Amino acid sequence: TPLVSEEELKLILAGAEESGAIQPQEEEMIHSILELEETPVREIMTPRVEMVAIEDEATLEDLLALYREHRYSRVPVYRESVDHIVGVAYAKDLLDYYAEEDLKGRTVASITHPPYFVPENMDAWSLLKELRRRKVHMAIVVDEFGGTAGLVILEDVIEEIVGEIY
Amino acid sequence: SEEELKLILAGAEESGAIQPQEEEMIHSILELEETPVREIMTPRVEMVAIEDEATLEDLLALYREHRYSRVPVYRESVDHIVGVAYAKDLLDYYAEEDLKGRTVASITHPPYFVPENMDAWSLLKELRRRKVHMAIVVDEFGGTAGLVILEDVIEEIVGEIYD
């Protein structure tokens, strides 16, 4: 029956979680749904300085070693520096080769998927939208001058909603 | 007030406060408590499982032939599940000799069993809590109703998430 605004609805959420009519964690989830439109990917991304990239001409042995030591399943791919990103590569794709012979035989370029670039200030709501309807759940966050601000994956948006898992 | 929140959420759609997409996701959040895992699980007949005594070379061959990253690991029949195996752990293992010399049991994680009737909300609670990613749905007799993963619940909140 009643009529309410976004601010009033967030207040009723706080007042029905201090009420016990809903769980603290169901509150935090629905609240998180609401804050997605106000979060820029910048606030949730992995920034350039902490990310693990690899060069297109490296070998698939090199990718395997990178997975073993930093444990990141999916890895951006650059040519000259990290500001010239040429695609993305997934460690599980190694399994289709998984031959101590074949791996040193091919370059990461041979398994690199085309890259998805979002501007540094897109909101998590739009990014969830864009990522869900795409086979690559990982976008490159780009700064205002064309450089690589960082990287952002769907599981990060997911965690924003639900919380940390894995 | 639980019915009150249920109703003012739809009202908040009507007062322009939230998009129908946001209200759809929030109705999904609310309807997690009322959805049983049977409604979302993959059942035995659609399932891909592997013996614990098989070799990691066998695991890899399975993965090639079927593309499933998570595999329930069973002992005698698929009604006696003893864990889950993750293809990614295969990447940690020496192509030549380490796969013919090790078996699936070396990499299986202990399983998580949920009743067939359990709701999604409690499933999500217990998965986030135990920090597992896949559970084995049992039937009232001990058999295997199917398997269910976190991304099932997630998509049940936010929509199909196509790899």
Ligand SMILES: CC[C@H](Sc1nc2c(N)ncnc2[nH]1)C(=O)O
């Ligand atoms: C997105 C995550 C899924 S997990 C999965 N494992 C399964 C199995 N053993 N049998 C039937 N269906 C399954 N789904 C994937 O990696 O494709």
